[PDB]
Amino acid sequence: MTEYKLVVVGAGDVGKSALTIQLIQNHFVDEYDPTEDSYRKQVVIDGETCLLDILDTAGQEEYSAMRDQYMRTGEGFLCVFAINNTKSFEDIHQYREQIKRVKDSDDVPMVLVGNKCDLAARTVESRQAQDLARSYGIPYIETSAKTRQGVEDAFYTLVREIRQH
Ligand SMILES: Nc1nc2c(ncn2[C@@H]2O[C@H](COP(=O)(O)OP(=O)(O)O)[C@@H](O)[C@H]2O)c(=O)[nH]1
Numbered sequence: 001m002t003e004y005k006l007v008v009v010g011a012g013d014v015g016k017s018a019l020t021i022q023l024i025q026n027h028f029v030d031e032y033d034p035t036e037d038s039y040r041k042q043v044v045i046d047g048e049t050c051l052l053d054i055l056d057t058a059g060q061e062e063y064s065a066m067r068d069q070y071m072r073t074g075e076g077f078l079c080v081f082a083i084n085n086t087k088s089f090e091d092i093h094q095y096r097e098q099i100k101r102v103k104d105s106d107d108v109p110m111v112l113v114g115n116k117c118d119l120a121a122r123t124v125e126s127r128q129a130q131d132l133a134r135s136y137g138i139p140y141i142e143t144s145a146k147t148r149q150g151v152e153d154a155f156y157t158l159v160r161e162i163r164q165h
């Protein structure tokens with residue numbers, strides 16, 4: 001059993017907790033804002049039996065006892081913005097820079113996640129986020145914590161990025 005420590009970061013309100021809860025507990029956080037838990041789930045991924053630790057961090061606008069500790073321990077990161085929140089997408093760069101600083105490494109397993117892809121209108125274009133992720137050298141995956149679309153894709157891609165590291 002290999003343990004994978006995955007950290008979800010991003011600005012407030014983008015769906016960090018919704019995504020984590022959707023993956024671990026298979027239901028949609030229709031406003032249940034936890035106040036930065038940690039989660040574990042045993043799952044078989046690509047024939048490997050894994051223990052996933054999901055560390056759900058708070059945005060930099062909010063008090064957080066554990067975000068710095070969660071970030072130092074994490075092996076891979078989901079960098080999450082909401083496709084209807086332009087500031088959240090602009091904040092991605094700070095979040096990535098800080099991950100690189102805490103891990104003391106430029107080659108940290110990461111996935112850029114554009115969440116809320118269920119929505120009818122958006123202010124951040126896929127092409128933008130794909131170009132930014134390309135410049136970072138990481139995958140871009142669009143997700144919906146509401147519909148569960150792409151959620152396992154995001155988290156498992158992170159796991160496979162950790163395996164390649
Ligand atoms: N429509 C839609 N709403 C979402 C999605 N993910 C989160 N939300 C909503 O966005 C708000 C903030 O979600 P939350 O998980 O607490 O974001 P966090 O602050 O980053 O942890 C909540 O009201 C959620 O119901 C999504 O994929 N689609």
Ligand SMILES: [Mg+2]
Nearest residue numbers: 016017033034
């Ligand atoms: Mg949250």
